Tab-separated table of C-alpha atoms and ligand atoms in Angstrom:
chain	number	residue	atom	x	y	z
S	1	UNK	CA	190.002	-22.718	207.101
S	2	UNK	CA	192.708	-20.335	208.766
S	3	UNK	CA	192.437	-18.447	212.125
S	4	UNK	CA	193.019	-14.958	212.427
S	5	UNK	CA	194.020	-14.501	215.746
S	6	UNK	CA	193.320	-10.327	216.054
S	7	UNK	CA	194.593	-8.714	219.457
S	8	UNK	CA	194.905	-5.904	222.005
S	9	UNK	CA	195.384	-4.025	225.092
S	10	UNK	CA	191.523	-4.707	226.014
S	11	UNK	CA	188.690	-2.478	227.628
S	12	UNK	CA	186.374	-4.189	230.032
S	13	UNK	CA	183.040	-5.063	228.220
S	14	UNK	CA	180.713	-4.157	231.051
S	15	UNK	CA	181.295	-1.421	234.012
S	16	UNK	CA	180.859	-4.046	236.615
S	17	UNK	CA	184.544	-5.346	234.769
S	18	UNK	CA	186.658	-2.680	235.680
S	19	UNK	CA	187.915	-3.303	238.778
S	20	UNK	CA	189.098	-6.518	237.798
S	21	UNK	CA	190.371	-4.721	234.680
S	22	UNK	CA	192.486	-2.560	236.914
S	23	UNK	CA	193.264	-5.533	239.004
S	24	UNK	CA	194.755	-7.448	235.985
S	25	UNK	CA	196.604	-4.254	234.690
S	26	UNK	CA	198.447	-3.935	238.182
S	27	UNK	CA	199.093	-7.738	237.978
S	28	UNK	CA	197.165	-9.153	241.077
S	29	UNK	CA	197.224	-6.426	243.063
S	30	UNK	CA	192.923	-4.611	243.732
S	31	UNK	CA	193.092	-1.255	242.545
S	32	UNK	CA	193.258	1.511	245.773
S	33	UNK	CA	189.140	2.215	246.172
S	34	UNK	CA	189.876	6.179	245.166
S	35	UNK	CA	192.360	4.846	242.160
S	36	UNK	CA	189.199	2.279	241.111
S	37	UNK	CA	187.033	5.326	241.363
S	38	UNK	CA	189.102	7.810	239.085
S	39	UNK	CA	189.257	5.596	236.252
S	40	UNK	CA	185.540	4.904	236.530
S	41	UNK	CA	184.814	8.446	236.227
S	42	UNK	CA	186.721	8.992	233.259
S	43	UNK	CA	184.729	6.105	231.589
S	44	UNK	CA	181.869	8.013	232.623
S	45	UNK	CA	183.145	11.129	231.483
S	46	UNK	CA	183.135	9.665	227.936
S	47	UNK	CA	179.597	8.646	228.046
S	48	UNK	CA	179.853	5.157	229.858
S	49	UNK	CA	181.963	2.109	228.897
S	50	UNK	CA	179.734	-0.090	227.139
S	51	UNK	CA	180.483	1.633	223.159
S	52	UNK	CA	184.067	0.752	223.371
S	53	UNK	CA	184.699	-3.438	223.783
S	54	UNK	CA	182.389	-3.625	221.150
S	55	UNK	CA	184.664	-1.465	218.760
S	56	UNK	CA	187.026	-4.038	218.711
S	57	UNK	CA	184.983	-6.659	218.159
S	58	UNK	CA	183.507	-4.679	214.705
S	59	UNK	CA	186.604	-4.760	213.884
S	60	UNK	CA	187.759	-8.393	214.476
S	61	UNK	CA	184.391	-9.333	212.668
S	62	UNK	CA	184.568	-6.888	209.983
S	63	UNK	CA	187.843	-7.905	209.262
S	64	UNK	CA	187.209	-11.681	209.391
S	65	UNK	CA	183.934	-10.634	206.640
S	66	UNK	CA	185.760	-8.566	204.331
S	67	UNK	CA	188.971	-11.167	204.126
S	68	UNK	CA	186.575	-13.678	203.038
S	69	UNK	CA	185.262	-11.528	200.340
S	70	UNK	CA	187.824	-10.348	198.696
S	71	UNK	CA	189.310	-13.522	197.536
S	72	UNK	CA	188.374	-16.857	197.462
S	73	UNK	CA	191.291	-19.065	198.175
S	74	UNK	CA	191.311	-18.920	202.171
S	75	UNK	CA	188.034	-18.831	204.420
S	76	UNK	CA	189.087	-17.332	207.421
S	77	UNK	CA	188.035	-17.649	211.144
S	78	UNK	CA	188.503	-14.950	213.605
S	79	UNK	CA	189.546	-15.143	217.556
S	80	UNK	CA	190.069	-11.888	219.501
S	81	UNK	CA	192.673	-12.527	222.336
S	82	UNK	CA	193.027	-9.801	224.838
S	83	UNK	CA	195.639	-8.701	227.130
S	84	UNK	CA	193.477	-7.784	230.157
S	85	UNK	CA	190.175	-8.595	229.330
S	86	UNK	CA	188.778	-12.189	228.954
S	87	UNK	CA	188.854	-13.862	226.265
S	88	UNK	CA	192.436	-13.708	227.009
S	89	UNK	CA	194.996	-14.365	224.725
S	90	UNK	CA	195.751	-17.569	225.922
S	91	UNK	CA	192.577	-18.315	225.594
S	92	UNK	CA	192.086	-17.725	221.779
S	93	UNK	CA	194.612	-20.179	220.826
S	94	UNK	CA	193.390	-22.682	223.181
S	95	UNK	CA	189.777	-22.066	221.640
S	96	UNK	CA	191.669	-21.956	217.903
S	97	UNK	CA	193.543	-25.295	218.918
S	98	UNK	CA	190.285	-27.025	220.201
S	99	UNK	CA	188.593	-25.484	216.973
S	100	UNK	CA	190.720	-27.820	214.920
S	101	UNK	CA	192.831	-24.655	213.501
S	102	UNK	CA	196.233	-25.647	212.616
S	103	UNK	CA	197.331	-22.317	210.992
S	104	UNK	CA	196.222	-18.849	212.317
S	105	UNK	CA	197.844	-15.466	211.002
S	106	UNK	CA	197.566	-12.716	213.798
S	107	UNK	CA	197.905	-8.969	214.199
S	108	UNK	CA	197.637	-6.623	216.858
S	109	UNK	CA	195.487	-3.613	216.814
S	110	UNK	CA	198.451	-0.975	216.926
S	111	UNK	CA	199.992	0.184	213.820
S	112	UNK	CA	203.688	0.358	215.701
S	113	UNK	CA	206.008	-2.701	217.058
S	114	UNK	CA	207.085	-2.523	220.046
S	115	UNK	CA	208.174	-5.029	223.025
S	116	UNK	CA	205.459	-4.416	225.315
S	117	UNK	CA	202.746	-4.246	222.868
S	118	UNK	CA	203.239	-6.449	219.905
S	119	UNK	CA	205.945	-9.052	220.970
S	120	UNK	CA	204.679	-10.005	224.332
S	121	UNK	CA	201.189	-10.630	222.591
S	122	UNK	CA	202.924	-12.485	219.345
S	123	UNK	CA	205.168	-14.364	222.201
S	124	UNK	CA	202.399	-15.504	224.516
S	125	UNK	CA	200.081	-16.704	221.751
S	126	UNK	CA	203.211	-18.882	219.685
S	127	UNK	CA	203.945	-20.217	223.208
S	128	UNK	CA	200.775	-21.476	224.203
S	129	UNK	CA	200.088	-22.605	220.604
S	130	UNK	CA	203.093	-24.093	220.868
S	131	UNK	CA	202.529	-25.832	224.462
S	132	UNK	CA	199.015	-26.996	222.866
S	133	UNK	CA	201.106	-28.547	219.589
S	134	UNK	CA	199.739	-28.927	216.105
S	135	UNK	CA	199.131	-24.897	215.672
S	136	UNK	CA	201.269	-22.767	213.738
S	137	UNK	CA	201.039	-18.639	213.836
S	138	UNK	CA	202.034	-16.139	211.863
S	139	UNK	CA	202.014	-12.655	213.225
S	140	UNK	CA	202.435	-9.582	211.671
S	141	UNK	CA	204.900	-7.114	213.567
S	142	UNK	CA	204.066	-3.823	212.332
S	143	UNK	CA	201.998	-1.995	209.906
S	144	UNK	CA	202.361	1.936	210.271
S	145	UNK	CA	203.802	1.802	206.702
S	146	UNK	CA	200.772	0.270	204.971
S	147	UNK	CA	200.147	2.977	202.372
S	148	UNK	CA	196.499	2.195	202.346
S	149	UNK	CA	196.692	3.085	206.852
S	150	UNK	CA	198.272	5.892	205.893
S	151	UNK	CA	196.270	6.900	203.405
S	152	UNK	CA	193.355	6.894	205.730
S	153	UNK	CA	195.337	9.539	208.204
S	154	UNK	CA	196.288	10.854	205.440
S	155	UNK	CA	193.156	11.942	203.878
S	156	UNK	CA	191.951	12.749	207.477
S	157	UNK	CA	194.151	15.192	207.959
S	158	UNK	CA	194.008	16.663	204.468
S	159	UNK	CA	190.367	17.332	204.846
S	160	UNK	CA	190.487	19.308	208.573
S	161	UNK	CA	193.432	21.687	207.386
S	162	UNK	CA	191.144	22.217	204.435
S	163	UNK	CA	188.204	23.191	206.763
S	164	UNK	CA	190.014	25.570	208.901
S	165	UNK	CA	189.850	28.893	208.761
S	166	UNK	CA	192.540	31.047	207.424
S	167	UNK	CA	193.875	32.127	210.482
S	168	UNK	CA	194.080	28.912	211.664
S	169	UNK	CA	195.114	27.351	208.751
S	170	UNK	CA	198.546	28.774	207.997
S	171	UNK	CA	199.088	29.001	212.073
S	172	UNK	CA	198.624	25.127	212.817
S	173	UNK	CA	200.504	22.510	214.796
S	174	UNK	CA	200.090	18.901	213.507
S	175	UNK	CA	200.731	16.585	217.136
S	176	UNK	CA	201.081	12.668	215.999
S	177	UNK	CA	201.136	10.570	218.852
S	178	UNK	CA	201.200	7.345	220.443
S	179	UNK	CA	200.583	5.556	223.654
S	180	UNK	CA	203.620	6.032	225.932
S	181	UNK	CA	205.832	3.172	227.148
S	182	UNK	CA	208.677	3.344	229.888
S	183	UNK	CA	212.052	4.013	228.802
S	184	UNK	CA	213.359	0.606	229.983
S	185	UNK	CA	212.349	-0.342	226.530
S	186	UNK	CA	215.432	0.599	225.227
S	187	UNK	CA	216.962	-2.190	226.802
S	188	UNK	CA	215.917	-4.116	224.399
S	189	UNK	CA	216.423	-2.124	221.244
S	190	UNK	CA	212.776	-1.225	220.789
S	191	UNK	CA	212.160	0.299	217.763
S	192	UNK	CA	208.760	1.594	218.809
S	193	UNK	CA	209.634	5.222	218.792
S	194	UNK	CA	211.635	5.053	215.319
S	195	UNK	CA	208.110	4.252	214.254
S	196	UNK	CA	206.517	6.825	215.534
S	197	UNK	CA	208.550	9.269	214.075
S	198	UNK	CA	208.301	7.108	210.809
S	199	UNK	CA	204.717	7.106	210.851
S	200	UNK	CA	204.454	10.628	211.776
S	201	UNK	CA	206.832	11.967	208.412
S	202	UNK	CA	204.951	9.724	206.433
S	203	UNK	CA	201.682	11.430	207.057
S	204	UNK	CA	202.257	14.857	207.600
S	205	UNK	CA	204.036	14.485	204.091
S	206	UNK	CA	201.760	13.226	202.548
S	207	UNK	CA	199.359	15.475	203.943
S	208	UNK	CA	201.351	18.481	203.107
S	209	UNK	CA	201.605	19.622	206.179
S	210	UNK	CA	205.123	21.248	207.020
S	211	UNK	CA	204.560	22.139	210.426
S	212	UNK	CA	204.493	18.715	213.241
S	213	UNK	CA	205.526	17.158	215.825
S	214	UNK	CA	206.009	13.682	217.672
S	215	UNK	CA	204.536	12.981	221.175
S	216	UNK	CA	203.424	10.762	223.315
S	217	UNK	CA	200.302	10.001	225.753
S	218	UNK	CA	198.518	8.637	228.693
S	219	UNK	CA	201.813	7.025	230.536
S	220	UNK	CA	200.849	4.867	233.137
S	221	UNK	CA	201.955	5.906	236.617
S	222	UNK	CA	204.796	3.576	237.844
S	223	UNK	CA	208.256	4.276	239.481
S	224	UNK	CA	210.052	4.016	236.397
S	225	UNK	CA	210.233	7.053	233.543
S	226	UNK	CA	208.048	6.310	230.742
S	227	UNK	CA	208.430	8.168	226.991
S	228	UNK	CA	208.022	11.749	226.616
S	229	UNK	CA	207.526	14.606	225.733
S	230	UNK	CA	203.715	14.002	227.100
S	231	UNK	CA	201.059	15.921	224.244
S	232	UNK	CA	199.706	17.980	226.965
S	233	UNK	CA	203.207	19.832	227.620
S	234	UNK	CA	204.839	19.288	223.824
S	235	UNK	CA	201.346	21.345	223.299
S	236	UNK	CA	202.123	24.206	225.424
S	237	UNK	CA	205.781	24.814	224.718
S	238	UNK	CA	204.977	24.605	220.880
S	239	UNK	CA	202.896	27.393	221.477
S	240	UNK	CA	205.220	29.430	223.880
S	241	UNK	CA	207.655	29.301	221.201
S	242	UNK	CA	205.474	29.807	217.791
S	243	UNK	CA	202.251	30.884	219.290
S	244	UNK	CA	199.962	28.754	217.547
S	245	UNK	CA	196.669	29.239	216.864
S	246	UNK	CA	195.329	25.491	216.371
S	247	UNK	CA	196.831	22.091	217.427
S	248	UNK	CA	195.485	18.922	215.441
S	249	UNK	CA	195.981	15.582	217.260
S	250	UNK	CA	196.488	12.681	215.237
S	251	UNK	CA	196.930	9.650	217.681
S	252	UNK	CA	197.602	7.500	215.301
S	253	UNK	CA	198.855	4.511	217.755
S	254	UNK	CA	195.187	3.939	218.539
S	255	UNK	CA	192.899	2.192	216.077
S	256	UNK	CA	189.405	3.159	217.896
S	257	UNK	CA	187.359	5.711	220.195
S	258	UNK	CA	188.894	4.625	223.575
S	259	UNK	CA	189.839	6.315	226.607
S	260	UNK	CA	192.756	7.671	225.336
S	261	UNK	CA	191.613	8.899	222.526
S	262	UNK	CA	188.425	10.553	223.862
S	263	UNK	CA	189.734	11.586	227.527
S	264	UNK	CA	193.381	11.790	227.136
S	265	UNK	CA	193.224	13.758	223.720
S	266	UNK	CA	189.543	15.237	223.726
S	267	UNK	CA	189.462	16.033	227.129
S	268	UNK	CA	192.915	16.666	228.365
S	269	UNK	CA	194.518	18.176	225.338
S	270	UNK	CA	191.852	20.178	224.679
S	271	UNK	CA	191.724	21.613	228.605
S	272	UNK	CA	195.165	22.648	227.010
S	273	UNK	CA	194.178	24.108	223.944
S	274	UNK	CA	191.442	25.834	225.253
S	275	UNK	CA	193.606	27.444	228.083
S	276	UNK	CA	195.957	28.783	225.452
S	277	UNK	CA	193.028	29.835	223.290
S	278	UNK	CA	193.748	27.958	220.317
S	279	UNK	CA	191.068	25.336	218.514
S	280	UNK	CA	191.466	21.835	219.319
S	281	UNK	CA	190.959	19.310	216.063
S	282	UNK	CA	191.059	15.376	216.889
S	283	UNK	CA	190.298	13.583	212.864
S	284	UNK	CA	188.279	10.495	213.095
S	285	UNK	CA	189.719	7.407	214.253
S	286	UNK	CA	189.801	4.431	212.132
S	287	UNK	CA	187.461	2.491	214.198
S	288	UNK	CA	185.674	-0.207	212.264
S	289	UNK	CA	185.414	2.103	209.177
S	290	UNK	CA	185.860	0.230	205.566
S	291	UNK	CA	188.620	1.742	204.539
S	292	UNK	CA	190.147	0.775	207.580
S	293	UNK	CA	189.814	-2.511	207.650
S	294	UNK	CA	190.574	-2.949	203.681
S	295	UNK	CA	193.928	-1.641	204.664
S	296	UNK	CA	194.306	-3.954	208.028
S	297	UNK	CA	193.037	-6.842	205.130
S	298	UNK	CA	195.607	-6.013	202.961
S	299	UNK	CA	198.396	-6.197	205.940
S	300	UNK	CA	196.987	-9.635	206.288
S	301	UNK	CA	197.122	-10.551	202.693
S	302	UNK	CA	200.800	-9.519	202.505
S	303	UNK	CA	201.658	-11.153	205.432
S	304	UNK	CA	200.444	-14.524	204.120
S	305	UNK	CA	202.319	-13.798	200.631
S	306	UNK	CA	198.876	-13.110	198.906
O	401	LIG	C1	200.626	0.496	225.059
O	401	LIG	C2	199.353	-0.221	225.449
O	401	LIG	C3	198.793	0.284	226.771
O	401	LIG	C4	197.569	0.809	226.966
O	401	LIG	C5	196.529	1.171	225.911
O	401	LIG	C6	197.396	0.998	228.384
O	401	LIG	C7	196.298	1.498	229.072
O	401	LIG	C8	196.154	1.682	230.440
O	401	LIG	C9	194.904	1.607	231.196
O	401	LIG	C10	193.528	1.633	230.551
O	401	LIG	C11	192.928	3.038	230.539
O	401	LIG	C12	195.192	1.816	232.503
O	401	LIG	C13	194.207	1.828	233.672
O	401	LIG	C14	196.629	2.033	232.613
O	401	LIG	C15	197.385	2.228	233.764
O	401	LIG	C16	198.530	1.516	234.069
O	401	LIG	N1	199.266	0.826	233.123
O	401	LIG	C17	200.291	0.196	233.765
O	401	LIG	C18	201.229	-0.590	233.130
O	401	LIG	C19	201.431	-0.812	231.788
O	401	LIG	N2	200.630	-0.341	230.781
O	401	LIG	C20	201.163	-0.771	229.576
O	401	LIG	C21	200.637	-0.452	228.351
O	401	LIG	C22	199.412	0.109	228.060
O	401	LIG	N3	198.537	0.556	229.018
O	401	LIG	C23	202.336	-1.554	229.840
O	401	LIG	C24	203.200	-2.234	228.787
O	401	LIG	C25	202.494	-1.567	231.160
O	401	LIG	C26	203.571	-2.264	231.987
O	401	LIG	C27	204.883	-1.513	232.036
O	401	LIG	C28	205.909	-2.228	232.877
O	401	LIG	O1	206.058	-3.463	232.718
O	401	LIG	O2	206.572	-1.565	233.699
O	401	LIG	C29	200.220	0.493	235.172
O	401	LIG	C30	201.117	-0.091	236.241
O	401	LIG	C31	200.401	-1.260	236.916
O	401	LIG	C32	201.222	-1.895	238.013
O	401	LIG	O3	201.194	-1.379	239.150
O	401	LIG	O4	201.906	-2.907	237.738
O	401	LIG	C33	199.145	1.308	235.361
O	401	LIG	C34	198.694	1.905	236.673
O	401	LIG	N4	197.182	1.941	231.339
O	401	LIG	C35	198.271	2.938	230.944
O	402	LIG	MG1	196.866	10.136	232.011
């Protein structure tokens, strides 16, 4: 029996959680009471916080089913560790550990490497594993490239060029994005935006799609510069210069319906779209969707040489 030790960013499971949430993301330090209130009216604008914890956990679960379907050889055991939201990932191993696991293969829930997103978590769960002793990870770094992940954008794509109209159809703007991360990250040789951009040619290729660009989205607001152009303004001056008539968002460094997906894309980039009358098109994330997690299965698989 092998863990799979799945993780992420995290989004408080109950509204009575965000505060703390907030508190955890500014590292000890109580949100301001207006700053608190701001981000719980954005949950709210999306329809209420509850829908999206439970995302992940579909997909930690689905994935754990569907591994142990496919082939018969390893019965895995799924943990979810998160990164501000309990069960930490600390936590996982130690549960893992005290579990009796004594190999665990993990991934993160974001297609691109990068120091802050993928390495700290990777880091933090070999070191406690290590602290607790007898518990050996294997973590996968990256898996934009999958063809079977980006297939599924693929396809997505391919099917909402298809059902535009004519106008719009030869007069479109492909946006692939990710979440932003501060500059600083080049001081450590992050490849993060390489794999963007990667990621990015990959689909709009195969998609056929000639005409795209790479952005990023919902920076956090610290003193230091974090990666841009942001998709609200890479959105406008696309369309100052070619005049587009339709932007499609692909934000494929998010794996489910979140806030950045549905505010920061549905709601923001679409404030933009609409005030340079042009249609806004967002394809389904992948969510917990089959196809989805047969492709984050197959990362898995190849990981573990299977
Ligand atoms: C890529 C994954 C990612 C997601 C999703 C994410 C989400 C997120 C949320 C949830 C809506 C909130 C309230 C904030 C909002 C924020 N997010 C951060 C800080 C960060 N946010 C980071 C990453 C990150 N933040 C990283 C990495 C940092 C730390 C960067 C550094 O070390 O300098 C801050 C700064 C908090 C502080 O004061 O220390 C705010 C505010 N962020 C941007
Ligand atoms: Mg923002």
């Amino acid at each position: 029996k092998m863990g799979l030790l799945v993780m992420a960013y995290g989004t408080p499971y109950k509204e009575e959680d965000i505060e703390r949430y907030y508190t955890h993301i500014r590292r000890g330090r109580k949100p301001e009471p207006e700053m608190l209130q701001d981000l719980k009216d954005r949950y709210e604008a999306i329809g209420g916080i509850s829908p999206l914890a439970q995302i992940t956990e579909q997909q930690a679960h689905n994935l754990e089913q569907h591994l142990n379907e496919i082939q018969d050889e390893i019965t895995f055991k799924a943990y979810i560790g998160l990164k501000h939201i309990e069960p930490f990932i600390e936590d996982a191993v130690a549960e893992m550990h005290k579990d009796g696991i004594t190999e665990a293969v993990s991934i993160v829930l974001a297609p691109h490497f990068s120091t802050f997103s993928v390495q700290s978590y990777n880091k933090r769960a070999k070191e406690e594993a290590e602290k607790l002793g007898g518990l050996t990870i294997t973590s996968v770094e990256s898996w934009y490239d999958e063809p079977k992940f980006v297939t599924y954008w693929v396809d997505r794509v391919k099917e909402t060029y298809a059902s535009m109209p004519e106008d719009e159809r030869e007069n479109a703007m492909l946006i692939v994005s990710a979440h932003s991360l501060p500059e600083k990250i080049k001081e450590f040789g992050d490849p993060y935006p390489d794999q963007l951009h990667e990621s990015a040619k990959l689909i709009a290729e195969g998609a056929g799609v000639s005409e795209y660009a790479v952005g990023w989205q919902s920076e956090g607001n610290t003193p230091d510069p974090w990666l841009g152009p942001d998709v609200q303004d890479l959105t406008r001056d696309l369309f100052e210069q070619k005049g587009y008539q339709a932007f499609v968002y692909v934000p494929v460094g998010f794996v489910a319906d979140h806030l950045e997906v549905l505010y920061d894309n549905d709601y923001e980039c679409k404030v933009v779209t609409d005030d340079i009358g042009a249609s806004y098109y967002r394809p389904e994330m992948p969510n917990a969707k089959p196809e989805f997690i047969d492709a984050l299965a197959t990362v898995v698989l190849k990981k573990l040489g299977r």
